[PDB]
Amino acid sequence: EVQLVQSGAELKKAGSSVKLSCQAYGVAFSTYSFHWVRQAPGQGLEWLGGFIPLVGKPNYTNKFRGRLTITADESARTTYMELRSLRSDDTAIYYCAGGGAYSSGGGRFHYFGMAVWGQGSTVTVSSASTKGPSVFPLAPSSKSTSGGTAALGCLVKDYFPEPVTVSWNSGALTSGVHTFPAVLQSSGLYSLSSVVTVPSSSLGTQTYICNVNHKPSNTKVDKRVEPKSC
Amino acid sequence: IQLTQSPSTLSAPVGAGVTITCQASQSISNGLAWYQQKPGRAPKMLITEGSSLKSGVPDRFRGSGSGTHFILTISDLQPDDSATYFCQQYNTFPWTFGRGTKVEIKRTVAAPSVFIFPPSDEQLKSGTASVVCLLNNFYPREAKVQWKVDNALQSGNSQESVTEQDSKDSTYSLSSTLTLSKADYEKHKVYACEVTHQGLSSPVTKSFNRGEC
Amino acid sequence: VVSTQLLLNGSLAEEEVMIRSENITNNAKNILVQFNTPVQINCTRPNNNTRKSIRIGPGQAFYATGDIIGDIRQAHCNVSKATWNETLGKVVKQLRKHFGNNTIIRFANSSGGDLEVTTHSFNCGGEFFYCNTSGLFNSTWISNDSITLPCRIKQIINMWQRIGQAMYAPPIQGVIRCVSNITGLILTRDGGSTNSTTETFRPGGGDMRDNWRSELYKYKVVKIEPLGVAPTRCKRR
Amino acid sequence: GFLGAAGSTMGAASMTLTVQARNLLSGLTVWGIKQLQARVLAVERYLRDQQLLGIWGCSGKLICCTNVPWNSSWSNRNLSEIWDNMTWLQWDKEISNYTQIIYGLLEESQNQ
Amino acid sequence: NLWVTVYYGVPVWKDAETTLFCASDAKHNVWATHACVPTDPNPQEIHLENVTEEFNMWKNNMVEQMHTDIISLWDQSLKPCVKLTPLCVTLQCTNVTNNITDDMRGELKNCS
Ligand SMILES: *[C@@H]1O[C@H](CO)[C@@H](O[C@@H]2O[C@H](CO)[C@@H](O[C@@H]3O[C@H](CO)[C@@H](O)[C@H](O[C@H]4O[C@H](CO)[C@@H](O)[C@H](O)[C@@H]4O)[C@@H]3O)[C@H](O)[C@H]2NC(C)=O)[C@H](O)[C@H]1NC(C)=O
Ligand SMILES: *[C@@H]1O[C@H](CO)[C@@H](O[C@@H]2O[C@H](CO)[C@@H](O[C@@H]3O[C@H](CO)[C@@H](O)[C@H](O)[C@@H]3O)[C@H](O)[C@H]2NC(C)=O)[C@H](O)[C@H]1NC(C)=O
Ligand SMILES: *[C@@H]1O[C@H](CO)[C@@H](O[C@@H]2O[C@H](CO)[C@@H](O)[C@H](O)[C@H]2NC(C)=O)[C@H](O)[C@H]1NC(C)=O
Ligand SMILES: *[C@@H]1O[C@H](CO)[C@@H](O[C@@H]2O[C@H](CO)[C@@H](O)[C@H](O)[C@H]2NC(C)=O)[C@H](O)[C@H]1NC(C)=O
Ligand SMILES: *[C@@H]1O[C@H](CO)[C@@H](O[C@@H]2O[C@H](CO)[C@@H](O)[C@H](O)[C@H]2NC(C)=O)[C@H](O)[C@H]1NC(C)=O
Ligand SMILES: *[C@@H]1O[C@H](CO)[C@@H](O[C@@H]2O[C@H](CO)[C@@H](O)[C@H](O)[C@H]2NC(C)=O)[C@H](O)[C@H]1NC(C)=O
Ligand SMILES: *[C@@H]1O[C@H](CO)[C@@H](O[C@@H]2O[C@H](CO)[C@@H](O)[C@H](O)[C@H]2NC(C)=O)[C@H](O)[C@H]1NC(C)=O
Ligand SMILES: *[C@@H]1O[C@H](CO)[C@@H](O[C@@H]2O[C@H](CO)[C@@H](O)[C@H](O)[C@H]2NC(C)=O)[C@H](O)[C@H]1NC(C)=O
Ligand SMILES: *[C@@H]1O[C@H](CO)[C@@H](O)[C@H](O)[C@H]1NC(C)=O
Ligand SMILES: *[C@@H]1O[C@H](CO)[C@@H](O)[C@H](O)[C@H]1NC(C)=O
Ligand SMILES: *[C@@H]1O[C@H](CO)[C@@H](O)[C@H](O)[C@H]1NC(C)=O
Ligand SMILES: *[C@@H]1O[C@H](CO)[C@@H](O)[C@H](O)[C@H]1NC(C)=O
Ligand SMILES: *[C@@H]1O[C@H](CO)[C@@H](O)[C@H](O)[C@H]1NC(C)=O
Ligand SMILES: *[C@@H]1O[C@H](CO)[C@@H](O)[C@H](O)[C@H]1NC(C)=O
Numbered sequence: 001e002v003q004l005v006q007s008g009a010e011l012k013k014a015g016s017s018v019k020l021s022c023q024a025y026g027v028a029f030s031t032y033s034f035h036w037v038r039q040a041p042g043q044g045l046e047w048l049g050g051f052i053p054l055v056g057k058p059n060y061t062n063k064f065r066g067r068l069t070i071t072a073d074e075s076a077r078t079t080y081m082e083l084r085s086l087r088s089d090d091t092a093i094y095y096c097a098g099g100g101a102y103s104s105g106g107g108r109f110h111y112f113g114m115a116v117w118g119q120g121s122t123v124t125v126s127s128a129s130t131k132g133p134s135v136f137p138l139a140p141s142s143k144s145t146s147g148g149t150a151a152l153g154c155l156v157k158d159y160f161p162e163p164v165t166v167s168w169n170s171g172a173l174t175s176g177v178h179t180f181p182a183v184l185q186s187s188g189l190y191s192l193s194s195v196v197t198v199p200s201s202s203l204g205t206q207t208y209i210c211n212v213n214h215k216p217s218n219t220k221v222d223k224r225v226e227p228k229s230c
Numbered sequence: 231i232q233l234t235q236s237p238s239t240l241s242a243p244v245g246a247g248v249t250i251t252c253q254a255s256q257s258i259s260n261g262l263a264w265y266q267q268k269p270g271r272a273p274k275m276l277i278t279e280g281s282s283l284k285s286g287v288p289d290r291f292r293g294s295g296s297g298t299h300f301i302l303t304i305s306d307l308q309p310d311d312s313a314t315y316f317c318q319q320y321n322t323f324p325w326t327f328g329r330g331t332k333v334e335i336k337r338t339v340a341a342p343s344v345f346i347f348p349p350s351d352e353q354l355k356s357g358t359a360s361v362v363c364l365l366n367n368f369y370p371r372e373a374k375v376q377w378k379v380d381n382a383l384q385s386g387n388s389q390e391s392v393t394e395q396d397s398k399d400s401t402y403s404l405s406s407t408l409t410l411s412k413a414d415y416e417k418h419k420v421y422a423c424e425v426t427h428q429g430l431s432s433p434v435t436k437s438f439n440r441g442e443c
Numbered sequence: 444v445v446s447t448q449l450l451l452n453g454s455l456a457e458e459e460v461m462i463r464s465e466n467i468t469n470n471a472k473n474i475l476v477q478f479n480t481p482v483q484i485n486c487t488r489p490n491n492n493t494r495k496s497i498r499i500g501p502g503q504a505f506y507a508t509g510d511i512i513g514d515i516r517q518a519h520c521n522v523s524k525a526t527w528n529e530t531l532g533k534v535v536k537q538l539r540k541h542f543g544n545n546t547i548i549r550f551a552n553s554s555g556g557d558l559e560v561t562t563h564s565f566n567c568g569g570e571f572f573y574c575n576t577s578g579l580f581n582s583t584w585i586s587n588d589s590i591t592l593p594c595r596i597k598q599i600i601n602m603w604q605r606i607g608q609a610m611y612a613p614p615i616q617g618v619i620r621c622v623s624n625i626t627g628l629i630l631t632r633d634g635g636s637t638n639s640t641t642e643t644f645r646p647g648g649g650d651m652r653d654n655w656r657s658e659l660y661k662y663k664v665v666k667i668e669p670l671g672v673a674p675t676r677c678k679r680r
Numbered sequence: 681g682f683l684g685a686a687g688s689t690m691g692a693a694s695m696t697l698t699v700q701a702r703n704l705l706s707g708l709t710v711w712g713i714k715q716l717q718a719r720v721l722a723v724e725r726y727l728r729d730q731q732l733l734g735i736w737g738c739s740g741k742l743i744c745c746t747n748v749p750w751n752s753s754w755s756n757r758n759l760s761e762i763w764d765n766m767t768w769l770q771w772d773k774e775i776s777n778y779t780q781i782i783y784g785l786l787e788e789s790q791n792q
Numbered sequence: 793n794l795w796v797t798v799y800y801g802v803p804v805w806k807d808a809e810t811t812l813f814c815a816s817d818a819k820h821n822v823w824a825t826h827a828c829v830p831t832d833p834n835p836q837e838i839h840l841e842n843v844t845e846e847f848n849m850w851k852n853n854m855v856e857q858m859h860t861d862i863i864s865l866w867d868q869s870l871k872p873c874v875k876l877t878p879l880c881v882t883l884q885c886t887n888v889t890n891n892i893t894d895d896m897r898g899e900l901k902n903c904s
Contacts, residue, residue, distance in 0.1 A: 028688050101691055103694045178393055180403075672796050676794055687840055746797065
């Protein structure tokens with residue numbers, strides 16, 4: 001199969017430049033069309049650009065003309081996107097997609113869409129600085145037990161910017177796990193709380209650990225959740 | 231080329247079929263693709279060339295049309311179909327997406343499960359206290375949540391977070407967080423959340439007292 | 444390289460000892476064995492020979508053997524005993540994948556034929572050696588030193604198993620020594636019927652196509668057909 | 681390079697035709713005669729292909745559109761699963777039955 | 793609305809037999825390597841991705857050509873050399889003595 005791997009999250013300043021990379025596995029790089037798309041928070045999709053590396057002449061949207069550059073490296077089989085003079089509205093999730101094309105002669109090329117998608121990279125520009133996440137274990141108690149099921153979890157506070165990845169038991173436990181979307185406070189930082197409901201009989205026998213990762217600050221915290229001692 | 235997608239929102243019960251219409255400002259031959267996206271996930275292509283079904287996609291999705299009118303039809307709705315659908319054209323540069331339609335699932339009304347929790351001691355050491363009360367597996371999504379600190383209503387200091395519809399039973403979950411300073415937390419003793427739901431005959435109140443398990 | 448019963452100066456397998464046969468259950472077919480590591484063999488003719496020229500006509504000379512100065516000894520080859528032990532162990536281990544795990548496997552010597560097919564025949568610096576390999580293939584296997592193979596020398600040569608044309612090899616002057624790699628084997632199996640629990644393998648050869656079939660075994664030749672038609676939606680203008 | 685896209689789809693292999701095109705012309709007395717015949721045969725094959733292309737109206741081209749419509753009885757697969765989920769080696773094995781009919785149609789369409 | 797389009801230079805091949813020629817690195821040798829084409833220092837090898845082929849070791853036609861070439865070169869190398877017709881006469885032979893060993897008895901003869 002064909003897979004695309006992108007870089008990590010990016011935090012930049014206004015007026016600077018940002019570069020993103022996308023590496024492909026499973027196809028011939030020179031004859032496969034690659035496209036860069038973006039999605040603003042709470043908005044639709046916006047096709048930024050795309051090209052076939054063999055032709056060597058990328059196509060751009062007129063809105064982003066003069067600010068966007070798309071290049072390729074066949075030796076490393078990776079495509080690079082450079083965006084210059086970032087503004088306040090450029091914080092978004094950027095996707096790298098791929099598709100196949102053919103030729104009918106005389107410079108005519110026919111495409112089929114974007115069958116393969118990357119996982120996306122979050123790009124944010126603001127005046128704030130990086131802040132390590134703070135993790136607090138939402139311990140189970142008698143007030144969080146209903147019908148033999150007790151709800152526990154972990155809350156993340158005082159971190160910036162997005163995102164933070166939360167997992168339970170290194171991904172072993174997935175059923176009943178609810179990760180509420182992060183919200184913005186007046187302090188300018190984000191906060192969320194990922195919870196999970198488990199049978200009350202397993203509280204004293206099953207160990208629950210929440211693993212939280214904050215890549216831009218390079219933070220990995222494993223917090224154990226236990227019933228509060230009384 | 232501009233693509234108009236209708237309807238903006240649509241909800242149907244399990245077992246019924248839905249139709250989404252994509253209309254082009256000018257002829258694009260038959261170069262249209264239908265994509266599906268779930269919250270917190272990259273888009274996945276469903277239909278290419280307008281009517282050719284992609285590999286690994288269930289037969290329930292059908293695409294048809296030509297000229298400037300295309301239709302996407304879901305014959306047998308399933309609990310995993312609540313998601314955002316897009317139509318895109320690739321016939322001529324630049325490529326443009328539609329506005330998208332958020333297909334939702336209609337089911338029976340279910341009562342919420344109410345839980346509450348005071349802030350942990352580690353958070354209390356930082357001078358900030360967050361009391362969190364959660365409503366689990368309640369449908370529909372609309373509900374009323376109120377905070378009462380020592381029988382006094384609190385406003386302007388609570389934040390509500392709602393997750394998207396579940397892909398298994400089509401139920402919502404809500405979390406209400408009340409954030410205060412440490413002095414405000416230790417000033418009062420009794421804290422409660424009151425929840426009003428369509429399926430609940432009376433509002434459900436979950437209360438606790440500071441310093442008690 | 445032209446040789447019988449042993450493959451010399453060839454290529455080595457990358458991972459294990461390779462056993463190849465057109466039909467392994469048919470005992471009329473030969474088995475080609477490719478080694479993983481080579482076995483060094485040292486062959487020599489120790490006599491100090493003299494060459495004399497005799498004019499047999501206008502502008503025509505004949506090179507005869509003169510006198511041998513010193514003593515006269517027999518040409519021979521040496522192989523390592525431990526290395527041959529290890530190689531035969533690997534070969535029998537690979538053979539036990541086609542005939543069972545509890546079958547006794549024994550190596551015997553050749554059986555009948557002319558001098559070329561019953562001996563390891565090769566060429567060492569202008570001299571044609573025919574060596575007796577009864578000490579190499581003589582053992583049985585149940586689920587510092589050296590081996591000396593005596594050799595003979597011949598001067599009238601019939602190559603390619605033909606008749607009507609013979610070649611005379613003029614003598615070489617001085618002592619002769621050569622060192623080579625054994626990198627393969629040619630074997631044949633005896634058709635033991637009547638519920639035989641043992642298998643006997645004997646060295647073979649004679650046909651030189653199997654010598655160069657062990658090198659041109661991973662190549663094939665293809666012919667390009669660069670013309671195709673396909674359905675598009677472009678029309679001639 | 682040469683034959684590089686033999687495992688790629690039909691669409692990907694349509695952008696490297698010149699690589700195969702170039703490697704068809706230059707890329708005792710007993711042995712001397714044998715080698716000469718090979719070169720003469722290669723020249724003859726190249727000239728026959730060029731004459732066929734010229735007769736079809738496609739002189740000096742690598743990709744050539746025609747006026748002959750595609751009969752659905754030759755193949756029913758749509759363009760999405762031909763140019764994107766198929767190689768030329770598989771396509772030849774499927775359309776080997778109808779090749780002569782298509783060639784005759786091309787000739788008689790170009791002549792008329 | 794589909795039309796036939798012609799592509800010249802597609803990566804398709806078939807099985808065939810032909811005459812391969814000899815090359816050697818760049819004087820009196822039985823196999824006339826001097827008469828073969830010089831070999832390039834760095835040959836090209838193109839790995840065909842996603843390609844599965846069928847091979848048959850025991851029905852390869854390169855072996856027959858190699859056998860024929862070796863035999864022909866051996867026969868050619870003997871043309872300009874001396875014929876030994878007058879050597880087919882009656883020889884008077886005696887056993888060889890003077891420092892032979894036990895295993896070398898009767899292996900050499902002194903013939904006039
Ligand atoms: C397997 O391969 C090995 C390695 O290639 C090979 O061993 C080599 O054998 C040759 C032939 O006997 C040796 O070359 C000879 O070496 C000495 C020193 O030069 C001389 O006896 C010979 O030169 C004389 O004869 C030539 C013939 O015309 C004259 O041109 C020259 O002027 C001399 O008069 C000849 O070069 C070579 O040294 C060995 N190599 C080693 C490392 O021992 C072996 O024979 C191959 N086995 C088989 C079965 O083919
Ligand atoms: C045609 O052959 C190529 C290789 O010659 C195949 O590409 C290979 O596809 C696999 C799919 O799993 C790739 O593995 C993946 O690689 C990375 C790194 O580990 C990661 O995404 C996954 O964990 C997985 O291991 C593999 O790297 C890739 N090989 C190359 C050289 O790119 C291709 O799949 C074959 N095509 C078909 C249709 O079979
Ligand atoms: C390989 O050789 C074996 C014999 O060693 C062949 O099997 C024989 O098949 C014939 C019929 O074709 C039977 O009458 C014999 O009894 C079989 N012999 C044995 C020992 O079972 C086999 O067909 C050969 N394989 C091929 C592919 O030709
Ligand atoms: C092969 O090995 C034999 C035995 O080692 C060598 O022949 C002679 O053997 C005697 C004892 O039997 C030793 O004293 C001699 O030193 C050996 N000769 C030499 C020249 O060392 C024989 O030489 C070996 N042949 C080869 C080609 O290596
Ligand atoms: C064949 O002859 C080679 C030399 O031509 C022998 O290799 C030598 O072995 C001796 C004794 O172990 C070592 O001291 C030398 O250093 C070796 N020389 C080289 C160049 O490696 C080899 O042992 C002989 N093989 C047999 C089976 O007799
Ligand atoms: C295979 O080995 C056997 C057994 O050593 C050889 O048979 C010997 O032949 C010689 C004459 O050549 C006799 O003097 C011996 O008595 C025989 N031995 C036995 C046990 O009968 C046989 O010649 C060898 N075959 C070959 C070398 O082709
Ligand atoms: C090949 O070697 C074997 C083993 O050395 C020879 O068999 C011996 O032959 C002699 C006579 O040449 C007999 O006296 C021995 O009894 C035989 N040995 C055994 C174990 O039977 C065999 O003859 C040789 N082949 C030849 C010389 O052609
Ligand atoms: C081979 O025989 C010849 C004679 O046919 C021997 O040469 C003669 O040897 C005797 C005794 O030493 C001399 O007196 C003569 O002068 C030699 N020459 C001739 C022409 O008669 C020769 O020594 C024999 N060689 C061997 C190895 O036995
Ligand atoms: C014998 O094999 C060794 C090890 O592979 C190799 O280095 C050497 O060149 C070979 N010798 C001959 C004479 O081919
Ligand atoms: C060689 O392998 C093929 C399968 O790849 C098998 O059918 C055949 O029997 C094998 N031959 C031998 C001699 O092991
Ligand atoms: C062979 O004899 C010649 C001529 O007498 C001599 O020069 C040479 O050293 C001898 N070679 C040996 C004894 O190995
Ligand atoms: C050779 O192998 C045989 C069979 O295993 C063994 O009995 C014999 O001792 C070995 N010879 C050696 C190691 O010299
Ligand atoms: C033969 O024995 C070996 C010992 O390693 C084993 O791996 C193999 O499976 C056995 N083969 C059989 C029982 O057919
Ligand atoms: C064959 O092997 C046997 C058993 O080791 C041995 O006695 C005999 O001498 C060998 N024959 C040879 C080496 O010719």
